């Protein structure tokens, strides 16, 4: 979806094979706050939320706790105590085609700053003046959504990027969402130092 309608899929009920996916040979950026990116297999969480959207490559640097700019203020604000990972890889092979791609939108105007993890999908006409817009478009009555000019032959700066933010949340739960446990073959008839399932 467009970044103003960032999509939350509650990934769970499954074996959390992070350090499996790690080496996908495609990820440009992989920043993990608070947890080791190569030991995330051993550090597992209760629920993982995958918030997906598409932004342009210049804007990725704003996607970090406590950052400021345009994306982090009017589209999607990361929590300041965020504990999770951020994943983003170039996707210009897909989300742009000759003639441009205008199916991606992002909010441009807002009265008040988004509180962290808030979703807003209103289509109201922004009012920057001092008079009621009375549902009338014009001067001092602006539409708040601006498209993206995605073209496959730009530079990387405007070149579209796909982003997935895994938000590792932990409560007083049995925490089934965990990485694979390795096993070693059975050796009999020798004084060995075992550790069976428990």
């Amino acid at each position: 979806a467009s970044v103003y309608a960032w999509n939350r899929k509650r990934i769970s009920n499954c074996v959390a094979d992070y350090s499996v996916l790690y080496n996908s040979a495609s990820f440009s950026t992989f920043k993990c706050y608070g947890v080791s990116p190569t030991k995330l297999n051993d550090l597992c969480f209760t629920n993982v939320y995958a918030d997906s959207f598409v932004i342009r490559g210049d804007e990725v640097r704003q996607i970090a706790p406590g950052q400021t700019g345009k994306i982090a203020d009017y589209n999607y604000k990361l929590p300041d105590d965020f504990t999770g990972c951020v994943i983003a890889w170039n996707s210009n092979n897909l989300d742009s085609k000759v003639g441009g791609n205008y199916n991606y939108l992002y909010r441009l105007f807002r009265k008040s700053n988004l509180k962290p993890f808030e979703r807003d999908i209103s289509t109201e006409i922004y009012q920057a003046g001092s008079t009621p817009c009375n549902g009338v478009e014009g001067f001092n009555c602006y539409f708040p959504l601006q498209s993206y000019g995605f073209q496959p032959t730009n530079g990387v700066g405007y070149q579209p990027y796909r982003v997935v933010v895994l938000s590792f949340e932990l409560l007083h739960a049995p925490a089934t969402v965990c990485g694979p446990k390795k096993s070693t073959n059975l050796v009999k008839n020798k004084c060995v130092n075992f550790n069976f399932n428990g």
Partner: antibody, heavy 123, light 109 residues
């Protein structure tokens, strides 16, 4: 201080093209809008068009519907007006105006006016 | 798309008497969207009244606009001997924004 700094005078030729710029300083230029007006030496004022600084949406008068392009630079807070296929019968003074708009809410009138640039065109 | 006639063409008040310039529209307009400017010879016009009723910053108390639905008038309470110049109406309907014919007030004596 609320003000616009505008370009300098020029001498241009028939069939040429010109581009005029006026910088904004002293206010939150990121949310205001700019319109361009031109006036001969002592005649009724003439409206060209206007552009929203943020979105970049524009609007042009029917006389100049085709042969004008208005651009802006968010980085340096500067707006450009470009005239195409200019003629000797457009010699006038060009003003750019924008309201005082500062980060909270802003006025329903174009308070700030530049000093105007005179564009002279003669053979 | 919107026509703004401006009459009377010129006016001659000795400084201080009470004056009115008038402009008119032939279509629909939102009454806060007509503004007045004055232009001294050689200078860019300055904003005087926006919203047809609200004075901008620094303008003297001596002026106040009227602003009916489509019938607009700027009351002058007095000429302070600076105020002899031209004046213009300008509209913000969704149509292209135009300007008036411009009215000039001359000094006598």
């Amino acid at each position: 201080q609320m003000q616009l700094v505008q370009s300098g005078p020029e001498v241009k030729k028939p069939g040429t093209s010109v581009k005029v710029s006026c910088k904004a300083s002293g206010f939150t230029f990121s949310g205001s809008a700019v319109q361009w007006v031109r006036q001969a030496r002592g005649q009724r004022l003439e409206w060209i068009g206007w552009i929203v600084v943020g979105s970049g949406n524009t609007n042009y008068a029917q006389r100049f519907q085709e042969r004008v392009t208005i651009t802006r630079d968010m980085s340096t807070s500067t707006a450009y007006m470009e005239l195409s296929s200019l003629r000797s019968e457009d010699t006038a003074v060009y003003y750019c105006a924008a309201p005082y708009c500062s980060s909270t809410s802003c006025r329903d009138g174009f308070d700030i006016w530049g000093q105007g640039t005179m564009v002279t065109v003669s053979s | 798309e919107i026509v703004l006639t401006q009459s009377p063409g010129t006016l001659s008040l000795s400084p201080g008497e009470r004056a009115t310039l008038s402009c008119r529209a032939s279509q629909s307009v939102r009454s806060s969207y007509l503004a007045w400017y004055q232009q001294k010879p050689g200078q860019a016009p300055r904003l005087l009244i926006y919203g047809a009723s609200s004075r901008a910053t620094g303008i003297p108390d001596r002026f106040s606009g009227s602003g009916s639905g489509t019938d607009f008038t700027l009351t002058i309470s007095r000429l302070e001997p600076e105020d002899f110049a031209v004046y213009y109406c300008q509209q913000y309907g969704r149509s292209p924004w135009t300007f008036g014919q411009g009215t000039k007030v001359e000094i006598k004596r």
